[PDB]
Amino acid sequence: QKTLHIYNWSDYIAPDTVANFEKETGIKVVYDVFDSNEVLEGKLMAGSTGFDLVVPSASFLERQLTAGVFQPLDKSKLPEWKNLDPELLKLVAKHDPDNKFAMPYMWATTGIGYNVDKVKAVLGENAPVDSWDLILKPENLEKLKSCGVSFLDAPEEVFATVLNYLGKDPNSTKADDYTGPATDLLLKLRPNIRYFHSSQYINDLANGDICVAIGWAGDVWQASNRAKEAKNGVNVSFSIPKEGAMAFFDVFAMPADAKNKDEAYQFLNYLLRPDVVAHISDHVFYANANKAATPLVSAEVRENPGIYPPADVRAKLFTLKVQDPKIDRVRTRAWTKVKSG
Ligand SMILES: COCCOC[C@@H](C)OC[C@@H](C)N
Ligand SMILES: COCCOC[C@H](C)N
Ligand SMILES: COCCOC[C@H](C)N
Ligand SMILES: N=C(N)NCCCCN
Ligand SMILES: [Cl-]
Ligand SMILES: [Cl-]
Ligand SMILES: [Cl-]
Ligand SMILES: [Cl-]
Numbered sequence: 001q002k003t004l005h006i007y008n009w010s011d012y013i014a015p016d017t018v019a020n021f022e023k024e025t026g027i028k029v030v031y032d033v034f035d036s037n038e039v040l041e042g043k044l045m046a047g048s049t050g051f052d053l054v055v056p057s058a059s060f061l062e063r064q065l066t067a068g069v070f071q072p073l074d075k076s077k078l079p080e081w082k083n084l085d086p087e088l089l090k091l092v093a094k095h096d097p098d099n100k101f102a103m104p105y106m107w108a109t110t111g112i113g114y115n116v117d118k119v120k121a122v123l124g125e126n127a128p129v130d131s132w133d134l135i136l137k138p139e140n141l142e143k144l145k146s147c148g149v150s151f152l153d154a155p156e157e158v159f160a161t162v163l164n165y166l167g168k169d170p171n172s173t174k175a176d177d178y179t180g181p182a183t184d185l186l187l188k189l190r191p192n193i194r195y196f197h198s199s200q201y202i203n204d205l206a207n208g209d210i211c212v213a214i215g216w217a218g219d220v221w222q223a224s225n226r227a228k229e230a231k232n233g234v235n236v237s238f239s240i241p242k243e244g245a246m247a248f249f250d251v252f253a254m255p256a257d258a259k260n261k262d263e264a265y266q267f268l269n270y271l272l273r274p275d276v277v278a279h280i281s282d283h284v285f286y287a288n289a290n291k292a293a294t295p296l297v298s299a300e301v302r303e304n305p306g307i308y309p310p311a312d313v314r315a316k317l318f319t320l321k322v323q324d325p326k327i328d329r330v331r332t333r334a335w336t337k338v339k340s341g
Contacts (some may be wrong), residue, residue: 002027004263006052007249010035010199011222012106014283021270027263035199036153044069044255046213050329052258053267058249059156059320062095064191071079072100079271083292091142091319092249100249102267104289105282106218108307109317110157110246113201113220114202116235118147118211132165132241135212148210153196155335156320158214162186162247163316170246171321175330180339188229190341201227208234215238222283240313247291247317 001023003290006018010033018029032051034040039058043049044056056064062123064070075081081103088107096102112134119127119134122143128134132210135141141149143153154159162182165169172178194210201213213220220238252271254264270329273279275290278296285301287308302308310318323331 002260002263003030004028004260005030005053005266006267007032007034007040007054009033009055011202011219012055012284012286013281017276017280019209019322020276021267025263025266025268027266029267035265038155042175048257049255051180051255052264053252053254053261054142055105055252057320058092058095058102058251058272059254059322061251063322064253065096067102067153069256070101070253071258071269073103073254074265078103078269078272080269083274083290086288088249088289092251094319095249095291096251102253103271105250105277106245106272106286106288107249108286109119109240110152110154110214110248111217111310112162112241113205113215113223114237114239115147115205115208115211118208121241122146123210129193129237132161132243135214135241136162136165136185136189138185138192141189141192144195144212147213150192150199150201150204150206150210150213151176151193151196151216152216152338154330157181157246157248157325158186159294159331159335160320161214162320163253164244164246170244170318173258173324175327176186178330178334180326183337186334186338187341190338191269192206196339205236206230206232206234208232218284218286221304221307225285240306240309240317242316244316244318247314247319249319249322283302304338 004027037057041060042055088104092104093099106131135271160170163172163238168177201215202219204210206226217238224236227236274293274296277290278293281288281301282298
């Protein structure tokens, strides 16, 4: 009996994807989930993960490659590879030279999820939901505390977002930018932040328990759809703010000690099938990286500019770079100060 172990982000597959694969191939899939790049990276660096496939963000994979934790993908076993968007492959190749190790899966942005009615009640009809001012201006966050504020537990993304907002290089290599202005602003915001978490905010937005969050786009659209399906009167939306936002590219990769490689390739080729991955986008509200799949995606998802953004919006997006050891240390120490504030 063939088995296959997969570690993916939570809320990042359709409900029947695995069952359909199992029914087709006769392979038993053990599927587990995470909500943190740091948790995944720690597992990869500490020893065997026990998984045959894992799904880091590409900027984290860039760092992980130098430790040798992945094995290169045999493209001859990935004939549906051609379906992938060549322009996205080129962007991911900045992290994964010649696309040797990573298969792009989904991509989106780190923006603001919010309860439309609650934010307009607190900050008025002209609340600045088009701007990071909504949540990074202390005077606004002090008022939104009234209905609940969450930030991602994602230090590289939060600091890059703050640096961009402050007019710095999002990937600044100046240590004082982290210890000075970025820490200063985050510490002024901290008293108003209910929690730092990268998955509880979905249901809390959907249920009305928080009214604003730093969130990943498709997670927030899921929250919006859950409220609609519940017919609970909660109206959640998502904003890519005017100052720009971070884009991320999540990728499948194969640990170097994977046990069931043939099964892993069967699963990857299944995901390269346009109807399979379009079906996933339909349920998780994320743009997939498969150009052949785009016309098969539901119009509700494909025509949402907060999911498949147009060129003028993509032009304002930035990506993470890997930081050197000094900046990595300074950033991690600053994040510790912020969470316990
Ligand atoms: C795993 O392969 C058999 C398919 O069963 C799926 C469900 C019904 O049972 C396993 C649960 C515990 N995830
Ligand atoms: C467990 O082996 C793979 C076959 O399972 C089919 C499931 C019941 N959908
Ligand atoms: C065609 O989608 C690629 C999206 O890329 C975003 C970059 C930052 N421009
Ligand atoms: N920022 C990232 N690399 N990934 C976020 C994906 C979240 C899917 N629920
Ligand atoms: Cl069994
Ligand atoms: Cl090595
Ligand atoms: Cl008003
Ligand atoms: Cl449709």
